[PDB]
């Protein structure tokens, strides 16, 4: 009954202030992420994540999701997938040199 337009990590087109406000939520664990729609880029997507540190608190790392002109995506040239979910799974298993392994999603 669900679809790519309503996944556990799909919110739609949100604003920028609300973006850092959803991941910076002090009530969020380190590793939460979300897949919003392109806002300051082409009609692609944007996978943001959350991180913590003993420097000041918790910040947010925005990882723009690339889009292959053929019909796919790849935040990096070494990671291409044919489904926003597939890319969300790889990052949700091996940071592959990322800042953290995707584990939670935006509430």
């Amino acid at each position: 009954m669900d679809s790519i337009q309503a996944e556990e990590w799909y919110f739609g087109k949100i604003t920028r202030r609300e973006s850092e406000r959803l991941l910076l939520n002090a009530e969020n664990p380190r590793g939460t992420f979300l897949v919003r729609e392109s806002e300051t880029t082409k009609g692609a997507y944007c996978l943001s994540v959350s991180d913590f540190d003993n420097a000041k608190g918790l910040n947010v790392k925005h990882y723009k999701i690339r889009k292959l002109d053929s019909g796919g995506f790849y935040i990096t040239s070494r990671t291409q997938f044919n489904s926003l979910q597939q890319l969300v799974a790889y990052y949700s298993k091996h940071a592959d040199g990322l800042c953290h392994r995707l584990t939670t999603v935006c509430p």
Binding site: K61, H62, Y63, K64, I75, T76, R78, T79, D96, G97, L98, C99
Partner: peptide, 5 residues
């Protein structure tokens, strides 16, 4: 944003 490196 952040690059995957």
């Amino acid at each position: 944003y952040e690059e995957i490196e």
